[PDB]
Design a protein around this ligand. Structure first.
Ligand SMILES: [Mg+2]
Ligand SMILES: [Mg+2]
Lengths: 277, 251, 50, 1340, 50
DNA sequence: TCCGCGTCAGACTCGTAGGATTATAGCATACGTG
DNA sequence: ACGTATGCTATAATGTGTGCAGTCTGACGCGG
């Protein structure tokens, strides 16, 4: 029989009313006043018109079946708000809706990174300006050449072109040879290897031994300022909250803790050795 | 995740997910409007097409093709066959403390020996240098030991030379047919980017010095050092398991 | 047969790791089978002692 | 002979004089793309075809239409030089003239209403170089010619679809260039079916009904007729004697007077001639015989008017009696036969569930569009659209040609659409083959495998651009206003530009040129593939395709193809092979006229090769006459045997036409196994050119041909004296005869100096000519990177000795002297090219200054203020080439870092570091740096210093152009002026700016002075705009990617030498790794003392069966023996006469040497420049199969006072005592393959980690650990080593806890197992849960 | 092939003798690449059951 | 139960290389938070 | 006020299709 979701729906619209001028008015007049059956019919009837429109709005974002569904939503909003008393036809009024609803729904579900309408709307005028220029310049227009014709900013044009830059999927094969995708190459940013994990662990355990090698009033004041032992990373003036309650003596004692610690790094074998780092 | 070039890159699942959510939310919208059933039918058929395409794309009908006219990789696909998680990212693994290089002959070596380049074994035994360095007291910390190695200073070669002694290394050749496709030896540091392999065990690997490469692997744990010396040492592996016959034989 | 004897073992992990992975899992899901691990493939996967 | 040839002559052991000289090897690529751009006036080809095909396009209403006028190519925006550097396509503007014509609607066709006409751009097409390359985004790329199944018709049969029946089911298939497929196929019951697009299977009479054919007509077309006359009472039947042939007499067969055969008897050929000579026409027969026979036409009762019996219905006794009394005593049955004329359409109609024409178009429509209710027009439109519309369908010229000659037709050229005739004719030959006559075609025959070069493919992709524009034109025309809308508003230039760049990038055929060797370039452009789109696949590829087919002879090389899964599909073109005008291949052949082997050559197609018998080139000609021998070994019909003289029709031209370019360079190929010959020709392409180009002592002759045609060298366009020699360029003065009378006549050749390759190797052009040397037209002026006096120089020859050496040549392992390493002869150069990118991040723009945070004065020593390394600065891994800094954002300074930045200080600025530094391990010399900037942000000071040079160097370079062009232009006027007003010094008193002031008498030469005067001014005005183009493109802000602000490209030059691990080989596939560079003390040496260069293993020879290497060695030694004698006489400083006698005695030795070079013709000076190049060794040519034999080699060895054997008395260097017995020593031309160990060795302890798998990455490229696959795993399972495996599953791979924890434990010394559970499994859990399956870890 | 190779490597093949040598050479090396998968796949099949 | 035609499961193992799309109108009040 | 979203345009227009069609041996599962 038929097992294609496409052909099945396209069958069911092929057996649905094809309305005349005064027929549209008869149903529409009752549809606004809520006849229930009337709103269903005008819709059922003009599903065939939605398909002919989505026949030129394909290959841009979604599939043909996805354009029809969102194109049907335009016909419905057209039925929610049509004027039968006006002598002008419905097929004319409904086309303006079905063309809009499709374009709009493609603008959202086409790009992975959801680009709002505003940044997109503008981008199109920059691209459609590139058309005019390209045909007469016979040269694909630059960021400047587009900026000179609109008389608009250089960075605006450029930043809007940056958002047009499309994607390569992580699972994409590499050089017409699906030996490895980008995941089997692209490195993990977050976790650095043991070498970098143990760097901090060893360096910060060495400091725990250096803070116990200094004075009690020097390792108290120095640690709680940087937020090493304390809970919050305070400043020279803020160390006064604890017990210091000083501005001059906190600054002399902070630096006194650091001067004795700089000699602890010169004797262990770092200082200039760990300066490059 | 974003590329270095200001581009982004997304898995095909995210794209397949957006197909499911869009159609599902559009169905919520049409059930709000009490739309005619003929449309609701299409929406339900679509929703199922998207769900079935998310679980296993290429199965029920045409697999939903994407940007580069290729089919979107679905969920089932990452559990399916060679290219799945099992065979590719679980039973088989790229491994640390591993290096590979062109092999060449080692006609001076004994059976339990193999040439290992210095700059290879250098990088391979990196945590063993940092360890023996803190013991002698030459490194106070590890970033200090890191720079000592980087500068390739003279006394660091002698420490590297110390750890490697009485330490076996695994030598693998592709393809790994039988167990003898890996044998362990005692590395001999040699100045040069070529590995030097023992002629008699060339038979086990089927290793021809015509441009062959062999993977190196360092056994980390003391148990791995014992395993490598006990089971996987070249001297303890003579006869083939297939036939009670010596595979270690001049040619 | 070999191809069938591999898919027959009570271990479904050993079976899916082999082939027919789409079918193995579905049959194992409906049965609600629990693998207690005996084979090597099973413990090499989880990264345990062989 | 020529001058450049006089400098060094190659001794040729050929004995088959070349009647056909080797053609330009880059014929295909250049000629193909030439057709694509070629604006043919009528015979549409390439673009002209694409427009006439699609255009004219008219609106959907048909009131307005767009018409193609003419197109043109503008000169390139950026030339090759610039394009290669900037990084954008080397393309030309496409300006096409369109014409918008609109009709009147109610009026008939008011064609003259508004004929708008204007010119419009759409897309820029990548042009092809003179090398046959396309520069895409600054990469010279090559598009390989494709090999695909030829359109037309083709008959096949699955020799056993159902081995159940085991019946050979025959099938036919019409393959178009564009359109739907049309297949006809039988079935177990021999019912003819038709499957359009191989879709549903439909009865084969349904398509005929669709072509308006009644049941009667159908039968009348295929089957013959059997006449039955019912005369009075006796039933009678017409008999053609040749019908009851090989059948049994079921009844008593008797005639006017004689019983021939008895009941139940076989009718033999005797009985058939018995009846045929008796002239039998009518025979009386029983009524039981018709029971079974099928009635042909319809039979209505004359009386009633009803069908007594319809057409195609099995007759019976009662139906026949009903027909006899109806009033029909002249019934005509069909001629059903189970041996010959088979009844298929008959049994097929009984299955066929259709009725008339209109109903046949229904099931055809219900097949392809199932579910849509059919109308009269929808069903008719579909079927008419399939194979019967000028739009959908196109067989093409080749399609119709092959289609016609497959049906043995009348026409070569006909219609692009299938006619009714064509379809039935195809069904007819399918049924012919089924009967017995007719043979199926095979696909492996090159008569069915057509070649499709780039130009045809560029045409195809250019059509899709036009097809995608067709959509936007029609829709905008109909609904859009007629007047207002202009034609360019409806055209879009992107769909064409995009569809063409899709081809020049993404296609499998468009790939980066492999140019690591002149041979690689030339053999990769002569590559032909069956893969990519519209071809085959490794997954789909069979065997019989790959197999060498006897059609390949002379067309395709039997020994040229990768040994990888893409083995039999990829193939190089043969030497003298060329494309048929239609598409097939063709090979040269010497015509034999009335026995006489005429010099007239005919390129025979793959089809006509099978027809004539073709003698081999081994056959001997009688010096203008015929074959010396009566019997000649020849070949035809795809077989080989001996034939007589008059029977020979054609002959192989040369003995090298069987092989390719790759194989024509292998000497003594005749003494080499095809398996090792293939590998040898494959590795010869991988031969990285050396530092000093060394000529091959043991060549074939093809050497020069390759080097010259590759387009890597610079050959003279016009002969004359080299006015100026230089390392950068060459200036040559043209002779009077060749020089044009209009221009000055001084050619300019700016030689390509050291710069990068696609494989990161050196490219240089050194002058091979001396200052002020007389050069002939078409002579090599500058040599390439792998060429020497115009001859190809891939690797280097050296004294080799075959013998074992303490196992340092174990399995083909190589033992090379330090003396080779001392001469730095095997020292390849790698020109690496780094790049530094200034990007625009979210935080802010990056720049390029010397100000870099956390740095030593030592790093910024080689940089300038701008932040770029000086030209000529040596660099090493860690040193920074170009200083870059990016913005640093909200950065959480960790307490331990805020304290450390507060102690030692250096509060690093809010700008991150990412300076381009030399990669760890590389070290060389910066030779140049190029800076690209967007048109915007102000520049670095170094970027200004580089602009200074480009400008002031271009100002000088153009000053030099107009200067020497002036001198050559007045040089002419000076000679013109003497003719007429003869006055020498008095004319040369005042300066040369007042020479156009002086003239001559009313004469041709007065018009000449006016030409040169106004052409001098033409160059004087041209010089300004030439300066403008240079100046602007230097000031121009090069357009960059979005986000990028400016880039700095650095050019390095590392000098890597040979070392253990380096892979080298001969050209006989003899591979090997260098194991040890032996000390000069230890190297073996002859009694005389000179040591050996390489010591090879003799066991890499019997097993290999590549004895060509040993012959290469022997001849190389003989050749060197002669050079050693010439070297000695030139050192001794003897005489011109003494060298002349010896060298004349050398050139003339071979049996019938092809070249007969007399030295009495050579002048004394010409002899000594020759001898000086002969002293390194007399270069010898050994044609592929017409090479030298032992008789010739051993005779040459006696001239060199070398041993007849080729084995020398060798002494061990280590010791000094002799080896127990002689060893083969000689000079073998070996090669340095690209597989160098510095680009191979790798090591890793801990580094990057994968993104999801959380296991390490792959390759030294990304610094990744070696893969331990499941096969590698089972090995440890077998050993029993359990931790060694668990260690390689967890801590070495995923286990995030384990890897870091284990690291810390190793530095502690405690090598302790600390597992947890790999991440990649934790992924697999959630992945199965995401699939709606409860997978939890059930505990103890 | 009905007609084998008459020549050897010393004497040198004529033009066809080499063309004939090709037929056997390419098919022998075609079964080195393609047929190996059947034997390597057998190793895989055997292992899983054992 | 049996025989033809459909889907579905495999197809060796490791190494190296490199980069590009079309277009969603056009303009005016509604909805969400400093 | 700024960013995002929501809305309407009133000639008539009302059933789609686009695109690769030499894998192969072996094994069942739904109809017929
Ligand atoms: Mg090898
Ligand atoms: Mg080998």
């Amino acid at each position: 029989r038929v097992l294609d979701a496409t052909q099945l729906y396209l069958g069911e619209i092929g057996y649905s009313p094809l309305l005349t001028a005064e027929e549209e008015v008869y149903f529409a007049r009752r549809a606004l006043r809520g006849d229930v059956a009337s709103r269903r019919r005008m819709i059922e009837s003009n599903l065939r018109l939605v398909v002919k429109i989505a026949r030129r709005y394909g290959n841009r974002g979604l599939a043909l079946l996805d354009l029809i569904e969102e194109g049907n939503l335009g016909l419905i909003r057209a039925v929610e708000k049509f004027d039968p008393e006006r002598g002008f036809r419905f097929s004319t009024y409904a086309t303006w809706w079905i063309r809009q609803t499709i374009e709009r729904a493609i603008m959202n579900q086409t790009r992975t990174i959801r680009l709002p309408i505003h940044i997109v709307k503008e981008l199109n005028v920059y691209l459609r300006t590139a058309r005019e220029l390209s045909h007469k310049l016979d040269h694909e227009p630059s960021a400047e050449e587009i900026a000179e014709q609109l008389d608009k900013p250089v960075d605006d044009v450029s930043r809007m072109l940056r958002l047009n830059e499309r994607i390569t999927s992580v699972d994409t094969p590499l050089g017409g040879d699906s030996e490895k995708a980008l995941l089997d190459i692209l490195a993990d940013e977050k976790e650095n290897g043991p070498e970098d994990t143990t760097q901090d662990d060893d360096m910060k355990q060495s400091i725990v031994k250096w803070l116990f090698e200094l004075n009690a009033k020097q390792r108290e004041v120095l640690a709680r300022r940087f937020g090493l032992l304390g809970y919050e990373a305070a400043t020279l003036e803020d160390v006064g909250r604890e017990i210091g309650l000083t501005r001059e003596r906190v600054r002399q004692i902070q630096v006194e803790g650091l001067r004795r610690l700089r000699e602890i790094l010169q004797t262990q074998g770092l200082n200039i050795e760990a300066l490059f780092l | 995740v974003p590329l270095d070039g200001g581009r982004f890159a997304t898995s095909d699942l995210n794209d397949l997910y957006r197909r499911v959510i869009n159609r599902n939310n559009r169905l919520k919208r049409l059930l709000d409007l009490a739309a005619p059933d003929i449309i609701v039918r299409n929406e339900k058929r679509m929703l199922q097409e998207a769900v079935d395409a998310l679980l296993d794309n290429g199965r029920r009908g045409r697999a939903i093709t994407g940007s580069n006219k290729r089919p979107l990789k679905s969920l089932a696909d990452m559990i399916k066959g060679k290219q799945g998680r099992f065979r590719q990212n679980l039973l088989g693994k790229r491994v640390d403390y591993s290096g590979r290089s062109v092999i060449t002959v080692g006609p001076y070596l004994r059976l339990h020996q193999c040439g290992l380049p210095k700059k290879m074994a250098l990088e391979l035994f990196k945590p063993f240098i940092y360890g023996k360095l803190e013991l002698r007291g030459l490194a106070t910390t590890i970033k200090a030991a890191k720079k000592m190695v980087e500068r390739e200073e003279a006394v660091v070669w002698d420490i590297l030379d110390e750890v490697i002694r009485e330490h076996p290394v695994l030598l693998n050749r592709a393809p790994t047919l039988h167990r003898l496709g890996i044998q362990a030896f005692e590395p001999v540091l040699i100045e040069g980017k070529a590995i030097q392999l023992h002629p008699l065990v060339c038979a086990a690997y089927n290793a021809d010095f015509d441009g062959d490469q062999m993977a190196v692997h360092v056994p980390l744990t003391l148990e791995a050092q014992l395993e490598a010396r006990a089971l996987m040492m070249s001297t303890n592996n003579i006869l083939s398991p297939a036939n009670g016959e010596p595979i270690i034989v001049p040619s | 047969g070999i191809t069938k004897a591999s898919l027959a073992t009570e271990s479904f992990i050993s079976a899916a790791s082999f082939q027919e992975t789409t079918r193995v899992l579905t049959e194992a899901a409906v049965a609600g089978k629990r693998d207690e691990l005996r084979g090597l493939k099973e413990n090499v996967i989880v990264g345990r002692l062989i | 002979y020529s001058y450049t040839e006089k400098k060094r002559i190659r001794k040729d052991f050929g004995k088959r004089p070349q009647v056909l000289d080797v053609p330009y090897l880059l014929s295909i690529q250049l000629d193909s793309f030439q057709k694509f751009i070629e604006q043919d006036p009528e015979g549409q080809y390439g673009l002209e075809a694409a427009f006439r095909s699609v255009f004219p396009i008219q609106s959907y209403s048909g009131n307005s239409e767009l018409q193609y006028v003419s197109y043109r190519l503008g000169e390139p925006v950026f030339d090759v030089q610039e394009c290669q550097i900037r990084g954008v396509t080397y393309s030309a503007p496409l300006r096409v003239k369109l014409r918008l014509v609109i009709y009147e609607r109610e009026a008939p066709e008011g064609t003259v209403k508004d004929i708008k006409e204007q010119e419009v751009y759409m897309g820029e097409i990548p042009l092809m170089t003179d090398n046959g390359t396309f520069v895409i985004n600054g990469t010279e790329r090559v598009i390989v010619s494709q090999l695909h199944r030829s359109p037309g018709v083709f008959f096949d049969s699955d020799k056993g679809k159902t081995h159940s029946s085991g019946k050979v089911l025959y099938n036919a298939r019409i393959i178009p260039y564009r359109g739907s497929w049309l297949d006809f196929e039988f079935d177990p019951k021999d019912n003819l079916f038709v499957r359009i697009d191989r879709r549903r299977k439909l009865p084969a009479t349904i398509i005929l009904r669709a072509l308006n054919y009644t049941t009667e007509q159908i039968l009348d077309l295929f089957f013959e007729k059997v006449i039955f006359e019912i005369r009075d009472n006796k039933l009678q039947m017409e008999l053609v004697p040749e019908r009851l042939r090989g059948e049994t007499a079921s009844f008593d067969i008797e005639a006017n007077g004689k019983v021939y055969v008895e009941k139940g008897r076989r009718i033999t050929a005797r009985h058939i001639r018995q009846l045929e000579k008796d002239d039998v026409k009518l025979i009386e027969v029983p009524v039981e015989y018709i029971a079974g026979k099928v009635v042909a036409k319809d039979y209505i009762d004359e009386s009633t008017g009803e069908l007594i019996c319809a057409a195609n219905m099995e007759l019976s006794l009662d139906l026949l009696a009903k027909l006899s009394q109806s009033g029909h005593k002249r019934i005509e049955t069909l001629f059903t036969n189970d041996l010959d004329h088979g009844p298929y359409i008959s049994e097929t109609l009984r299955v066929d569930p259709t009725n008339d024409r209109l109903s046949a178009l229904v099931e055809i429509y219900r097949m392809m569009r199932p579910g849509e209710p059919p109308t009269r027009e929808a069903a008719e439109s579909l079927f008419e659209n399939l194979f019967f519309s000028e739009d959908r369908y196109d067989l093409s010229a080749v399609g119709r040609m092959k289609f016609n000659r497959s049906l043995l037709r009348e026409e070569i050229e006909g219609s692009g659409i299938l006619s009714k005739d064509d379809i039935i004719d195809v069904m007819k030959k399918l049924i012919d083959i089924r009967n017995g006559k007719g043979e199926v075609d095979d696909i492996d025959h090159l008569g069915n495998r057509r070649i499709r070069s780039v130009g045809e493919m560029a045409e195809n992709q250019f059509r899709v651009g036009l097809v995608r524009v067709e959509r936007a034109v029609k829709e905008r025309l109909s609904l859009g206003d007629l007047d207002t809308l202009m034609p360019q508003d409806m055209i879009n230039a992107k769909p064409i530009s995009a569809a063409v760049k899709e081809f020049f990038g993404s296609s499998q055929l468009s790939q980066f040129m492999d140019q690591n060797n002149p041979l690689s370039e030339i053999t990769h452009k002569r590559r032909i593939s069956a893969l990519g789109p519209g071809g085959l696949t490794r997954e789909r590829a069979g065997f019989e395709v790959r197999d060498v087919h006897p059609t390949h002879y002379g067309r395709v090389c039997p020994i040229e193809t990768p040994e990888g899964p893409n083995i039999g599909l990829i193939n190089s073109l043969s030497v003298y092979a060329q494309t048929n005008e239609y598409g097939f291949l063709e090979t040269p052949y010497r015509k034999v006229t009335d026995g006489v082997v005429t010099d007239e050559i005919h390129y025979l197609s793959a089809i006509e090769e099978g027809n004539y018998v073709i003698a081999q080139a081994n056959s001997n000609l009688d010096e203008e006459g015929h074959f010396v021998e009566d019997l000649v070994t020849c070949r035809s019909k795809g077989e080989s045997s001996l034939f007589s003289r008059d029977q020979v029709d054609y002959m192989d031209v040369s003995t090298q036409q069987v092989v390719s370019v790759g194989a024509s360079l292998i000497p003594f190929l005749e003494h080499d196994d095809a398996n090792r010959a293939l590998m040898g020709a494959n590795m010869q392409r991988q031969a990285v050119p050396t530092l000093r180009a060394d000529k091959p002592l043991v060549g074939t002759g093809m050497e020069r041909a390759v080097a010259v045609d590759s387009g890597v060298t610079a050959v003279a366009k016009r002969g004359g004296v080299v006015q100026y020699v230089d390392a950068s360029r060459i200036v040559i003065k043209v002779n009077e005869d060749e020089m044009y009378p209009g221009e000055a006549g001084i050619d300019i050749y700016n030689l390509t100096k050291y710069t990068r390759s696609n494989q990161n190797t050196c490219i240089n052009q050194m002058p091979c000519v001396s200052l002020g040397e007389p050069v002939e037209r078409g002579d090599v002026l500058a040599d390439g990177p792998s060429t020497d006096l115009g001859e190809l120089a891939l690797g280097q020859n050296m004294r080799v000795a075959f013998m074992p050496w303490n196992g340092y040549n174990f399995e083909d392992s190589i033992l090379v002297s330090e003396r080779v390493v001392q001469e730095d002869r095997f020292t390849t150069i790698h020109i690496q090219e780094l790049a530094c990118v200034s990007r625009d991040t979210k935080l802010g723009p990056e720049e390029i200054t010397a100000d870099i945070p956390n740095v030593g004065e030592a790093a910024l020593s080689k940089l300038d203020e701008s932040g770029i390394v000086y030209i000529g600065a040596e660099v090493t891994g860690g040193d920074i080439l170009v200083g870059k800094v990016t913005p640093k954002g909200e950065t959480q300074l960790t307490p331990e870092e805020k304290l450390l930045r507060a102690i030692f200080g250096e509060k690093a600025s809010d700008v991150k570091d990412s300076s381009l530094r030399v990669p760890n391990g590389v070290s060389g010399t910066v030779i140049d740096v190029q800076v690209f900037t967007r048109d915007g942000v102000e520049k670095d000071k170094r970027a200004l210093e580089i602009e200074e040079m480009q400008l002031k160097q271009a100002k000088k370079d153009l000053s030099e152009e107009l200067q020497i062009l002036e001198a050559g232009l007045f040089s002419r006027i000076r000679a013109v002026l003497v003719a007429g007003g003869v006055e020498a010094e008095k004319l040369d008193k005042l300066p040369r700016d007042r020479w156009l002031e002086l003239g001559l008498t009313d004469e041709e030469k007065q018009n000449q002075l006016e030409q040169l005067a106004e052409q001098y001014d033409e160059l004087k005005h041209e010089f300004e705009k030439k300066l403008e183009a240079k100046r602007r493109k230097i000031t121009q802000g090069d357009d960059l990617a979005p986000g990028v602000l400016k880039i700095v490209k650095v050019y390095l030059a590392v000098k890597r030498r040979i070392q253990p691990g380096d892979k080298m080989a001969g050209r006989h596939g003899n591979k090997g790794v260098i194991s040890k560079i032996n000390p000069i003390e230890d190297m073996p040496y002859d009694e005389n003392g000179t040591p050996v260069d390489i010591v090879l293993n003799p066991l890499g020879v019997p097993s290999r069966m590549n004895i060509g290497q040993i012959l290469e060695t022997h001849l190389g030694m003989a050749a060197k023996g002669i050079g050693d004698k010439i070297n000695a006489m030139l050192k001794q400083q003897q005489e011109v006469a003494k060298l002349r006698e010896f060298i004349q005695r050398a050139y003339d030795l071979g049996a019938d040497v092809r070249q007969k070079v007399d030295l009495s013709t050579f002048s004394d000076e010409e002899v000594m420049r020759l001898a000086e190049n002969l002293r390194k060794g007399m270069p010898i040519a050994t044609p592929v199969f017409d090479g030298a034999k032992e008789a010739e080699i051993k005779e040459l060895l006696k001239l060199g006072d070398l041993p007849t054997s080729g084995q020398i008395r060798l002494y061990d260097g280590r010791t000094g005592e002799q080896f127990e017995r002689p060893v083969t020593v000689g000079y073998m031309y070996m090669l340095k393959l690209n597989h160098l160990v510095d680009d191979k060795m790798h090591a890793r302890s801990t580094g990057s980690y994968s993104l999801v798998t959380q296991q390490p990455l792959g390759g030294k490229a990304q610094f990744g650990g070696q893969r331990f696959g499941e096969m590698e795993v089972w090995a440890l399972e077998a050993y029993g080593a359990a931790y060694t495996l668990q260690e390689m599953l967890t801590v070495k791979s995923d286990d995030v806890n384990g890897r870091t924890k284990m690291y810390k434990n190793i530095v502690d010394g405690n090598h302790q197992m600390e597992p947890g559970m790999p991440e990649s499994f934790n992924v697999l859990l959630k992945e199965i849960r995401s699939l709606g399956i409860n997978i939890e870890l059930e505990d103890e | 092939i009905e007609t084998p190779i008459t020549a050897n490597f010393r004497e040198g093949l004529n033009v066809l003798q080499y063309f004939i040598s090709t037929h056997g050479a390419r098919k022998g090396l075609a079964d080195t690449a393609l047929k190996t998968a059947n034997s390597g796949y057998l190793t895989r099949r055997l292992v899983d059951v054992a």
